[PDB]
Design an enzyme around this catalytic site. Structure first.
Site, PDB file in Angstrom:
ATOM      1  CD  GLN A 244      -2.816   1.415   2.246  1.00 46.11           C
ATOM      2  OE1 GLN A 244      -2.277   1.688   3.330  1.00 46.11           O
ATOM      3  NE2 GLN A 244      -4.151   1.341   2.086  1.00 46.11           N
TER       4      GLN A 244
ATOM      5  CG  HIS B 261      -3.848   4.966   1.783  1.00 50.32           C
ATOM      6  ND1 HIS B 261      -5.203   5.215   1.856  1.00 50.32           N
ATOM      7  CD2 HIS B 261      -3.446   4.690   3.048  1.00 50.32           C
ATOM      8  CE1 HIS B 261      -5.595   5.122   3.115  1.00 50.32           C
ATOM      9  NE2 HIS B 261      -4.550   4.797   3.858  1.00 50.32           N
TER      10      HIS B 261
ATOM     11  CG  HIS C   7      -8.586   5.442   5.716  1.00 52.42           C
ATOM     12  ND1 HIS C   7      -7.870   4.302   6.019  1.00 52.42           N
ATOM     13  CD2 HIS C   7      -9.859   5.038   5.483  1.00 52.42           C
ATOM     14  CE1 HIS C   7      -8.678   3.256   5.965  1.00 52.42           C
ATOM     15  NE2 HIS C   7      -9.891   3.674   5.653  1.00 52.42           N
TER      16      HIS C   7
ATOM     17  CE1 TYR D 133      -3.178   9.595   7.034  1.00 49.29           C
ATOM     18  CE2 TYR D 133      -4.515   7.754   6.331  1.00 49.29           C
ATOM     19  CZ  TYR D 133      -3.868   8.444   7.339  1.00 49.29           C
ATOM     20  OH  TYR D 133      -3.928   7.991   8.653  1.00 49.29           O
TER      21      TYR D 133
ATOM     22  NE  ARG E  18      -8.696  -0.315   2.707  1.00 50.48           N
ATOM     23  CZ  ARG E  18      -8.648  -0.608   4.003  1.00 50.48           C
ATOM     24  NH1 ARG E  18      -7.920   0.106   4.841  1.00 50.48           N
ATOM     25  NH2 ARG E  18      -9.352  -1.630   4.460  1.00 50.48           N
TER      26      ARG E  18
ATOM     27  N   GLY F  71      -8.736  -6.528   9.183  1.00 55.56           N
ATOM     28  CA  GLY F  71      -7.641  -5.795   9.802  1.00 55.56           C
ATOM     29  C   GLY F  71      -7.298  -6.351  11.170  1.00 55.56           C
ATOM     30  NE  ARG F  72     -10.516  -3.150  14.334  1.00 60.45           N
ATOM     31  CZ  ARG F  72     -11.605  -2.425  14.594  1.00 60.45           C
ATOM     32  NH1 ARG F  72     -11.675  -1.684  15.690  1.00 60.45           N
ATOM     33  NH2 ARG F  72     -12.617  -2.442  13.747  1.00 60.45           N
TER      34      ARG F  72
END
Ligand SMILES: Cc1cc2nc3c(=O)[nH]c(=O)nc-3n(C[C@H](O)[C@H](O)[C@H](O)COP(=O)(O)O)c2cc1C
Length: 362
Positions: free
Chosen positions: A98, A179, A182, A184, A231, A321-322
């Site tokens: 990424q 990316h 989010h 960015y 993404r 993810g987590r």
């Protein structure tokens, strides 16, 4: 069950649809923002994933916004990533890098020359990023007010993405993920809330998407379209960057444009960690009919939700993810319906092996 069936994803074939989401763990070496053997072990532990998507990785030194995040711009970084991709491949895995520029989610102390970070416009993100203290531990610090990129600086940003993708190819990555989510840099341009430009890179959705689409074209040309994923997080609010008053229409415009380039995949981050309104099936259908590659869903998914939406033909794979932080063998656990290891959020960012490579496999 469809989660454990193969999927062609551009140039590679995933043996299952359980993907590892990109996760910043902020454990790189400074100076140099260099991946480490410990990071190599962590990724190698997770190589049974249908696809590993790496932590966000700087395209350039200017791209840096978090202490401990790796880069893919220097020779030392390329050499270190080469070892990491070799390790994943030794275990018959697949890995995407990424690639990001953090834009205004950054701090002057980690910018080149200690100067202000850059963005579409000059307003502060009004959030925090993660730096390191005098002992190397992760600390949260208020973001620095950015400088608006000058028009003549835009080509350099596109070139930095292009070069980073060239570097990703040499480093042995299977795919790249841009990316564009989010809050960015790319998303900063996409969102009207963070983009007040009056040149051709602000205003209309066509202008706001201009940068990301220039980047997509540059990287497809540098390598191949079947090597490129992206993404997006185009519905809802993320890190104080919302998606504007016409978020659905603007999302479908962007997705239609991405589809023209024939890229490998579209990865949709559906919610921030703090939650948001769920995607409607109607909206999912509108996305599905516009994009003709793989669609990856993400954001608090369960296997049950993944199976439901894959079964309905609305997405092709799910990125966890987590659950991947805590379960290196998540694929085997979901396949067997085994219990998962408990998460230890205090060690998500920074530190060392503890909370990183010490979650056991079955
Ligand atoms: C510790 C941590 C680091 C993250 N780093 C990234 C990142 O580098 N790039 C990215 O696109 N998302 C990042 N995210 C978002 C995740 O990829 C994912 O979308 C989010 O965790 C929600 O999915 P989950 O419920 O399966 O964890 C991060 C999330 C966490 C918890």
């Amino acid at each position: 069950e469809k989660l454990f069936t193969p999927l062609k994803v551009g140039a590679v074939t995933a043996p299952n649809r359980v993907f590892m989401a990109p996760l910043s763990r902020l454990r790189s070496i400074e100076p140099g923002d260099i991946p480490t053997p410990l990071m190599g072990e962590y990724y190698r532990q997770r190589a049974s994933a249908g696809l590993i998507i790496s932590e966000a990785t700087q395209i350039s030194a200017q791209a840096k916004g978090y202490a401990g995040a790796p880069g893919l711009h220097s020779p030392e970084q390329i050499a270190a990533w080469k070892k990491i991709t070799a390790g994943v491949h030794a275990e018959d895995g697949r890995i995407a890098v990424q690639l990001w520029h953090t834009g205004r989610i950054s701090h002057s102390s980690i910018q080149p020359g200690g100067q202000a970070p850059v963005s579409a416009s000059a307003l502060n993100a009004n959030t925090r990023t993660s730096l390191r203290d005098e002992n190397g531990n992760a600390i949260r610090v208020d973001t620095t007010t950015p400088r608006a990129l000058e028009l003549d600086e835009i080509p350099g940003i596109v070139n930095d993405f292009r070069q980073a993708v060239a570097n990703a190819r040499e480093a042995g990555f299977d795919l790249v993920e841009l990316h564009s989510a989010h809050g960015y840099l790319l998303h900063q341009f996409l969102s009207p809330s963070s983009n007040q430009r009056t040149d051709q890179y602000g205003g209309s959705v066509e202008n706001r998407a201009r940068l990301v689409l220039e980047v997509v074209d540059a990287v497809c040309n540098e390598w191949s379209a079947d090597r490129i994923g992206i993404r997006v997080s185009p519905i809802g609010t993320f890190q104080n960057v919302d998606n504007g008053p016409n978020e659905e229409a603007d999302a479908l415009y962007l997705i239609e444009e991405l589809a023209k380039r024939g890229i490998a995949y579209l990865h949709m981050s559906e919610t921030d960690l703090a939650g948001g309104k769920p995607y409607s099936e109607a909206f999912r259908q509108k996305v599905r009919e516009r994009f003709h590659g793989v669609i990856i869903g993400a954001g608090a998914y369960t296997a049950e939700k993944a199976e439901d939406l894959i079964g309905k033909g609305l997405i092709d794979a799910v990125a966890f993810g987590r659950d991947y932080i805590a379960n290196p063998d998540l694929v085997a656990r979901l396949q067997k319906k085994a219990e998962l290891n408990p998460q230890r959020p205090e060690s998500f960012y920074g530190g060392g092996a503890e909370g990183y490579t010490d979650y056991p496999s079955l």
